[PDB]
Structures are given as structure tokens and as C-alpha cells.
């Protein structure tokens, strides 16, 4: 009868308003890549990086279409309902009135899909955090999203973020692994400045722990850690620039061109804009910390998040990408209220690290 406001399966045209217990899924495409390219090891540590055109299907409607279509591959079959852009996974989303028994069954099905195309048996949430990290880096480094699929760019993958984040929040909440990563994250922040050069070439470097902080730190805790993380991201850029292979101490501590810091600054901006999308999330005191409060917000607000994602992409695409100087970055990021000396803040930071 009526149309469905929120997410709608493109096969049956129905969503939660008529099937509030049917799991919705996002067609994704994941491939086996290296976690960190600057890892000084010969054989890079392996993970996976995923992209999406953000096409929605019920998990039953996907199986019904590929089962009745015998003679062709399951994922060659799903490409027709995925705007002819090839795919190999179906990321499940957990609706408000969807039973946890149904979502956990679909997440295991998606994990098996990841085991096949990426070869990574047992896809942990740590590997999934790196998957968000690599997806963030595709935004910040202006990399291609349609290179392996055939369609979809920043517009498509900016809406994949909250649900790719959700699977990390779900594993962090059921397995009670929040406090372990909380103490593990605080160890990264408390790293002395001698380790900063060495961490810019490690797998679980400053990029990974930034994505992790997004999952376990409230917005108030982020604003306090914004500058400290910004320092570690800036030193990461200089380390990877003056010594693209490996380094333990900063030799060339002189400020370089803005093109050397642009990747880390857009990475920082993309994370901050996502925190702005979730500025309305209840802080705590609700049967869980941040990873619980955020997971329930993502669960119940599919449409508020969609508009916030397009609003965040608009700010990233129109205001952050055209930035040419580090002083202009602090203007757009809004850090001038707490970083009063932009010229000295950089050169002092590169001098503060051995």
C-alpha cells in the first residue's frame, strides 16, 4: 500500500514499515589488501578493504533471487540487482524491531562471504576497524571506489560508514571487548614522542587507533583528544614523507609542502565530521558507555544518519578538499579556538619529536 520511508529492499520495495523483522543488507565488495603499506616487513600483514554502491536488499530477497536463478554464480546473479556493479558480500544492518537471532545469523553469513573473497578465516573486529581505516584513506587520498566494482564513489561509500561501523560496535558490545581496547587505545595516546616515528610505519599505527577512538570515545572525549591525535597524524605524514621506507627518529624535521600532510588532515576531518553526525547521541548512563550508546543510535536512526552523512560529505567535498594551507585547515576544522598559534603549532611539533 503505502511507501516505506527508511531503507527499502529494491527487490520487494518493502522496508521496516511492512516487514519490521526482516533483515536488510547492503551489497558490498571486499578484496584482500595489505593493512599497512608502509610496514617495513617484506610480506605485508594482510587484511581486507571493502566498498559499496549502497544498494539495499532483504537477506531473504537476495537468497530467493539467486536460488531461483540457477546456472550463474550467486554474486554474478546479485550484480543485476546491484546496478550492474559487481559485489561479493551483503553487510547486514540491525533494525530496531529485528531480532538479534536474525542479525547474528546474517552477520555470520556476511563473515563467510568475507572468508571467501579475502581468504581471511575468522574476520575479527580489529580487521574490520582496519577496513574502516582503509575506507577512510580512500576518501582522504582521493582513491577510486569504482575501480573494482564499476560504479559508486564518495556518495555511495559515505552511507556505508555507519553500518560498517555498526559491525565493529556489535562485536565490541557482545564480546565485552570495549575495556580492553579502551586501555589499549590509552596506551597509544600515552606513547612518548620517541615511539611516534616508529608507529608511523606499524600496522596498528595512528590511523588505526583514530578509527578505534571513533568507536569507544564520546564526542566530548574526542574534542579533548582532537589536537593530540592531530599531532600524531601530522608526525605520521612527515615520517612517511621524509623516509618512505622506515624510520625510528625524525631526521628531516622541517615543514614540508601541504601535499605531504593533506592525506592525514582529510582523514582527521572525515573522522571529526562523523562525530558531528553523531553529536545528538546520548553520552552515557544508558546501560553502556559510548560503543553502546552509539550502536543504539545507529540502530534506530537510519534516516537521520543518511541526511547527516550527505551533510558530512558535502562539508568534506566542498570545504575540506580544496584546502591548500595548514592555516586554512584549522580554519575549516575550527581548531583556532584552542590552537591560537597555527604557524608555530606545526614547526614546534616537528621539533618536539626526535
Amino acid at each position: 500500500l503505502i511507501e516505506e520511508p527508511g531503507l527499502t529492499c529494491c527487490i520487494c520495495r518493502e522496508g521496516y514499515k511492512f516487514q519490521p523483522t526482516k533483515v536488510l543488507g547492503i551489497y558490498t565488495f571486499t578484496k584482500r589488501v595489505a593493512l599497512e603499506e608502509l610496514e617495513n616487513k617484506p610480506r605485508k600483514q594482510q587484511g581486507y578493504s571493502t566498498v559499496s554502491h549502497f544498494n539495499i536488499v532483504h537477506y531473504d530477497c537476495h537468497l530467493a533471487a539467486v536460488r531461483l536463478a540457477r546456472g550463474r554464480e550467486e554474486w554474478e546473479s546479485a550484480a543485476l540487482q546491484n546496478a550492474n556493479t559487481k559485489c561479493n558480500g551483503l553487510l547486514p544492518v540491525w533494525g530496531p524491531h529485528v531480532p538479534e537471532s536474525a542479525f547474528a545469523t546474517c552477520l555470520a553469513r556476511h563473515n563467510t562471504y568475507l572468508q571467501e573473497c579475502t581468504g581471511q578465516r575468522e574476520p575479527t573486529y580489529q580487521l574490520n576497524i582496519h577496513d574502516i581505516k582503509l575506507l577512510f584513506l580512500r576518501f582522504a587520498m582521493e582513491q577510486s571506489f569504482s575501480a573494482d566494482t564499476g560504479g559508486g564513489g564518495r556518495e555511495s561509500n559515505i552511507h556505508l560508514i555507519p553500518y560498517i561501523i555498526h559491525t565493529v560496535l556489535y562485536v565490541l558490545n557482545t564480546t565485552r571487548a570495549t575495556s580492553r581496547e579502551e586501555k589499549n587505545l590509552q596506551g597509544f595516546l600515552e606513547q612518548p614522542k620517541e615511539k611516534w616515528v616508529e608507529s608511523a610505519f606499524e600496522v596498528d599505527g595512528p590511523y588505526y587507533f583514530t578509527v578505534l577512538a571513533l568507536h569507544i570515545l564520546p564526542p566530548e572525549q574526542w574534542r579533548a583528544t582532537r589536537v593530540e591525535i592531530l599531532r600524531r597524524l601530522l608526525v605520521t605524514s612527515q615520517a612517511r614523507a621524509v623516509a618512505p621506507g622506515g624510520a625510528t627518529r625524525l631526521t628531516d624535521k622541517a615543514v614540508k609542502d601541504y601535499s605531504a600532510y593533506r592525506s592525514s588532515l582529510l582523514f582527521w576531518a572525515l573522522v571529526d565530521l562523523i562525530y558531528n553526525m553523531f553529536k545528538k547521541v546520548p553520552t552515557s548512563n544508558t546501560e553502556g558507555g559510548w560503543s553502546c550508546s552509539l550502536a543504539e543510535y545507529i540502530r534506530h536512526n537510519d534516516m537521520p544518519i543518511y541526511e547527516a552523512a550527505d551533510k558530512a560529505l558535502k562539508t568534506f567535498q566542498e570545504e575540506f578538499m580544496p584546502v591548500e594551507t595548514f592555516s586554512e585547515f584549522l580554519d575549516v576544522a575550527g581548531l583556532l579556538s584552542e590552537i591560537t598559534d597555527p604557524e608555530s603549532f606545526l614547526k614546534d611539533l616537528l621539533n618536539s619529536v626526535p
Binding site: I11, C12, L68
Partner: protein, 153 residues
């Protein structure tokens, strides 16, 4: 008719979509009793020799809908390079390239636009494919014969 199955529930959705926002030139509806059989008319678009034609066709669904495409055939007499001799339509969207996201409205527009710009390199009617590229006068003359024949029903 209950409309309990997945199909029918979708066919009702395709009905309300084709009813409250029908494309220009086409109009369809299910049978009064069996929803698995639809009747649709496709008017010949202007700028083409099919203009002023009331071409009728029937669509037959199964309970596999929308996973499997429906069998569409022209009831009115048709002379087109991409239409077989029994009303069957040699179109990829209706056969191998069928997407479960396509509805009845998207099927009628694909057939409507197929009359305007045929696909002669992949022919279903050998006689109409050769006339569309060689003698444009005889092609638009034979099509005008089925335009008058579309009035005979």
C-alpha cells in the same frame, strides 16, 4: 485474492505504482480475477512510424516473481526487428539481463522505448531488421499497416 504470497504482494505494489503514476503512452492492469495475468496497451510514440497505434500486449507472471521475468507477448500484430513472429520480444531486460528490481512500469517503458529506437543488430524478425537499415520507406510503410491493424481488435 488474499495476496499473501511474496509475489502478488509485489504485483499489488506494481499495480499501485502503474495506477497512481503511469508512464505516458502505456497503461496496464491485472485481470479482474487472476492477478498473475495483466493486460497493457502501448501507444506508438510520436516521431516514429508506430504513432497513432493502440498496441495491446499481455503479461504473465509466476509465483517466482520478481526473481524470474514475466512472459510478455504482443496481442496486436507487430512488425519490429526485436519482436518475434508470435509476439515474443527479443529484449535482454526481459530475458537474461532481468533484474528483480524491475517492475511492470519499468517493463512497459523498456518496450515503449524499444519501438522508437529498435536494436537491429540483434534481430528477431529478419524481414524487419533488413528494412530498418536499407529501405526506410518500406519499413515505415509496413509499420503503418499494423498501426491500422492495431485498430482492428
Amino acid at each position: 485474492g488474499s495476496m499473501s504470497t511474496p509475489a502478488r504482494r509485489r504485483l499489488m505494489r506494481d499495480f499501485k505504482r502503474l495506477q497512481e503514476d503511469p508512464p505516458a503512452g502505456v497503461s496496464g492492469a491485472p485481470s479482474e480475477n487472476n492477478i498473475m495475468v495483466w493486460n497493457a496497451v502501448i501507444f506508438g510514440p510520436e516521431g516514429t512510424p508506430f504513432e497513432d497505434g493502440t498496441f495491446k500486449l499481455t503479461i504473465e507472471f509466476t509465483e517466482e516473481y520478481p526473481n524470474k521475468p514475466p512472459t510478455v507477448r504482443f496481442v496486436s500484430k507487430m512488425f519490429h526487428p526485436n519482436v518475434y513472429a508470435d509476439g515474443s520480444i527479443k529484449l535482454d531486460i526481459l530475458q537474461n539481463r532481468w533484474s528483480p528490481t524491475y517492475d511492470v512500469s519499468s517493463i512497459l517503458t523498456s518496450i515503449q522505448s524499444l519501438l522508437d529506437e529498435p536494436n537491429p543488430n540483434s534481430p528477431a524478425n529478419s524481414q524487419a531488421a533488413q528494412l530498418y537499415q536499407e529501405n526506410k520507406r518500406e519499413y515505415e510503410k509496413r509499420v503503418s499497416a499494423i498501426v491500422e491493424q492495431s485498430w482492428r481488435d
